[PDB]
Amino acid sequence: VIKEFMRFKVRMEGSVNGHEFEIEGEGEGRPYEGTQTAKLKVTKGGPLPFAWDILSPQFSKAYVKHPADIPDYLKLSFPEGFKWERVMNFEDGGVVTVTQDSSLQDGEFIYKVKLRGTNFPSDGPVMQKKTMGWEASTERMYPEAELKGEIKMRLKLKDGGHYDAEVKTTYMAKKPVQLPGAYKTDIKLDITSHNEDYTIVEQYERAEGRHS
C-alpha cells in the first residue's frame, strides 16, 4: 500500500488572530527515504497577514525514514491512517493548535488540516512577517495508547536572533498498531520557492528516525 514513491493532497482550514483562510496543495515524496515536497496554494483569505512559517510544519509524518528495529507506527497504520493533534506555544504567548486526519485513498495520502492560531502580538514577528524559516529540529518521540512527541523549534528572525516554540504533538492510529520505544526524529523543513506575497509556496522536508 505505501509504495516507495507516494503522492498526497492536503487541505487546511485555518484562522490566525481572527483572520480566516483556506489552503490546498499537493505533495510527493519517498516515504522510506524521508524526503518530500509539497506545493501549497492559498485559495481563500489570501494574502495572509502573518508569517508563512507558522503554517509550514502542519503540511506528513508517514515520510520519516525509520531504521528497522524502530516500529514505523504511522506507516503501519495505513490504509486506514491516523490523526495527530498538536499545540505550539511560542515564546511571546502565540498559540497554534492543529488537528489532522491523514488517510490513504486511490493510491495517495489525503490530508485534512484544521488550524487555530491566537494571541500573537500584532507587532511581534509572526504578525509582522519578520521570520525567515525554521531551524533544524529534533522531535523526541515516546509512547488509549498512542505516540507522543515534544519539540523545541527555533524560528529565524529577519533582523537577527531567534523566536522559540514549544511543540507537543499526539499521533493516534485509527487501528491498533505496535508502538515504538522512545526515539528521536531529526527534521529540517525548507521553503524551496515562493511567489511574492506567499500565496504559492513550495516546501521540502527530510526526516529520519534514530535512537537517542
SS3 string, 128-187, reads CCCEEEECCEEEEEECCCCEEEEEEEEEEECCCCEEEEEEEEEEEECCCCCCCCCEEEEE
CB-based contact 207:186 (threshold 8 Å): yes
Q: How far, in whole angstroms, is CA 126 from its chain's centroid?
A: 17
CB-based contact 36:115 (threshold 8 Å): no
CB-based contact 7:37 (threshold 8 Å): no
Length of the chain: 212
The reply to whether CATH 3.30.470.10 applies to domain 6-210 is no
Q: Name the one residue in this structure whose C-alpha cell is 523545541.
A: 152
Which neighbouring-strand residues pair with 13? 22, 114
> Resolution in A, one decimal?
3.2
